[PDB]
Amino acid sequence: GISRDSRHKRSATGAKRAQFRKKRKFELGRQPANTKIGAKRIHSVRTRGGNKKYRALRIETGNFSWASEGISKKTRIAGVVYHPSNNELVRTNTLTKAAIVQIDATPFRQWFEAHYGQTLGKKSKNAERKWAARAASAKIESSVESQFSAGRLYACISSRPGQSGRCDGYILEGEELAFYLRRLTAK
């Protein structure tokens, strides 16, 4: 099937290499998963040396790390919003590595209030003493406060769903965030 050898396509000089060495299994490929959103369905793949590989399809949720706070949570995905490789993946809402997505941002909002408690968007003394200590850090950035109002966060998939069956990533911040927002809003 899909083979990764190079005794096919032409040599450097442009010459064509003649046939040799009928296809080998250790030089194979397979076909893309094209993992979509919703109705979780993961299929297993028997790879070389056993080494089971999980092929994601129709996945639901993921583990996304808000880098600044050194935390991660389980949140959903709204859809693909920007894909550097092929714009076709965006329209079909296809999940790949480094495909910008919008996530649910719900657990993050309550975690922020649980951890900082000052405010986001818009009882016992054991709590605010932490808050008093965990002060001077509720000024994260003005470009993520506005995202919290709508309850969707621009996230990037840093995992390979086709290989590990999981969609993990991080929330865009700082320079990276300003790089995609200008690409998104241009008209």
């Binding site: 450097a12 880098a67 550097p84 490789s85 320079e175 990276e176 790089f179 995609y180």
Partner: protein, 144 residues
């Protein structure tokens, strides 16, 4: 070089696993990662204070120089981040007791930290397959 107006590609260009945190403020706003390639090759000043990415750079990328170290004269630099160098040698034909000129073209990836021209004598270090035909990486420029 001309700094290639770094943020030009569709995907954001960054050094992997090099995180800058916006909560705190200090000097060196964008952290830069680099390494010394060893074998006495020095890390050029441009790589330290540049802005390029070139994840194949032997000083600021994910590639490592190991194996043969070669030398040749740059003969074509019309690629992007790649040059072709010519390595001449005399092949000894045993019957006639004398030598004959020969040459080869070794396409080598050139880091943005270097500036090269046709005629520059450059040394390259072996590394893992970078592209279909690139297996060496420009590591020291000896002429201008």
């Amino acid at each position: 070089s001309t700094e290639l107006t770094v943020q030009s590609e569709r995907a954001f260009q960054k050094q992997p696993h090099i995180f800058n945190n916006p909560k705190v403020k200090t000097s060196k706003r964008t952290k830069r990662w680099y390494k010394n390639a060893g074998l006495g090759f020095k890390t050029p000043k441009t790589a330290i204070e540049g802005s390029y990415i070139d994840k194949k750079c032997p000083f600021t990328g994910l590639v490592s120089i190991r194996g043969k170290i070669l030398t040749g004269t740059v003969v074509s630099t019309k690629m992007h981040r790649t040059i072709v160098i010519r390595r001449a040698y005399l092949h000894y034909i045993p019957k006639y007791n004398r030598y004959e000129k020969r040459h080869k073209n070794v396409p080598v990836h050139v880091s943005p930290a270097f500036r090269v021209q046709v005629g520059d004598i450059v040394t390259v270090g072996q590394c893992r397959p970078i592209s279909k035909t690139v297996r060496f990486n420009v590591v020291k420029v000896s002429a201008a």
